[PDB]
Amino acid sequence: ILELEAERELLNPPPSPLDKKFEQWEEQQAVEATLAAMKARRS
Amino acid sequence: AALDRGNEQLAREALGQRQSYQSHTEALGKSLGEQRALVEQVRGQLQKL
Amino acid sequence: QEAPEDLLERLLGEMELELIELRRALAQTIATFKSTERQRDAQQLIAQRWYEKAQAALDRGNEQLAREALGQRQSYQSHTEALGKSLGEQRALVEQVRGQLQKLERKYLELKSQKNLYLARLKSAIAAQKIEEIAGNLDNASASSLFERIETK
Amino acid sequence: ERKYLELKSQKNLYLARLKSAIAAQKIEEIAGNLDNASASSLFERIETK
Amino acid sequence: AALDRGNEQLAREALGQRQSYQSHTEALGKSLGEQRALVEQVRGQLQKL
User: Fold this and answer.
1) Which of B30, B41, D8, D32 gets the most CB atoms within 10 Å of its CB?
2) Nearest one of C46, C62, C66, C45 to C54, comparing CA atoms
3) What does each C-alpha distance from C136 to B31, C73, C123, C148, E44 come to in angstroms?
4) How far apart (Å, rounded) are the C-alpha atoms in residues C118 and C131?
5) What is the superkingdom listed in this entry's lineage (chain A) (predicted)?
6) How far, in Å, CA of C120 to CA of A28, rounded?
7) Residue whose C-alpha is closest to residue C25's, from C84, C81, C101
8) Is D42 in contact with C58 (CB distance < 8 Å)?
9) Closest-CA residue to C43 (of C70, C74, C85, C66)
10) Contact C/D (≥3 CB pairs under 8 Å)
């Protein structure tokens, strides 16, 4: 199983943590920024 | 309605849940706009022909 | 000699075979790497349990039981440290080789682009003279073979 | 018993590295055959043709 | 957007990441401009012929 599983990962290059951070942080910006309007507009 | 009554915790989860489709939404919206020119382009191809 | 232009496909066809062969080979490397990672985890756990058995051992002022366990425990620790160093070592090599292929992969595809281009230019040139050689055969200065011959006839 | 199993682990590792290296030159030897400096066998020959 | 909010560290990595393609970009852009004359040149070759 380990033999097969790793091979699939090779053919599916996982993204770098930078995009993970950017996506995660941008999600933090997105969630808060999207929420920022909510807490302000729907105050 | 989630954040009403000062219960933002419920709203927090929903909006985070909501964008899950938004990410999908934007991907499609761009794609559909793309296809319009091609279908537009080909129509004149036949019409001219 | 065989037309080297034909070999381009055979050579690159020969080229492609090794990439996957490397591809499978590299994955085999990682599978071993993970296996060792798991194996270390078990050994530290039994030491962790021995640590937990030793943890409760000295309670109630019964250190004699704890004495044996901890001496027993390190038996795996000695093994533990040996593996931990080894696994850290292998990471750079697997890291190193990946860039080796990754860099190579770009090169092959990048290289492959020019192949057809010269082939295209080659087909352009080959006929470029074939078309014109007959033109000189009808250039009409007796450098041609028929036109003046026809004229003389 | 520990020694044999412990020894056996490294076997494939060198084999793996061996397979890495064997192709490492096989891939590149042809690269020099197309390095395009007349060190290659065809590219400049094609260019001259 | 990276350097916004005074978070330049994120921007630092991206731009360094970005040029990786720029180096590739410039290489291609020069190459494509080169090919245009040749395809242009050959067309007149046939057209004249």
Assistant:
1) D32
2) C66
3) 57, 95, 21, 12, 20
4) 19
5) Bacteria
6) 53
7) C101
8) no
9) C74
10) yes
Q: Would you say A6 and C31 are in contact if contact means Cβ atoms under 8 Å apart?
A: yes
Give residue for tokens 């990754």.
C102
Q: How was this structure determined?
A: cryo-EM
**Which two three-digit tokens encode residue C58?**
């000295």
E-proximal residues of A, 14-33, CB under 8 Å: 18, 21-22, 25-26
What is the resolution of the experimental data for this entry, in Å? 4.5
- The encoded tokens of residue C52 equal 């937990």
Per-residue tokens: E42:
């050959």
Side chain identity at C10, as an amino acid letter?
R
Residue with tokens 């990048």: C110
Burial of C104-140, coded b for 16+ CB within 10 Å and e otherwise, reads beeeeeeeeeeeeebeebeeeeeeeeeeeeeeeeeee
Residues annotated in a binding site of C: 23, 112, 137, 139-140, 142, 144
Of A9, D30, E9, which is closest to residue C11 (Cα–Cα)? D30
What is the greatest pairwise CA distance in chain E? Answer: 65
- Class of residue C73 by CB neighbours under 10 A (exposed 0-12, middle 13-18, buried 19+): buried
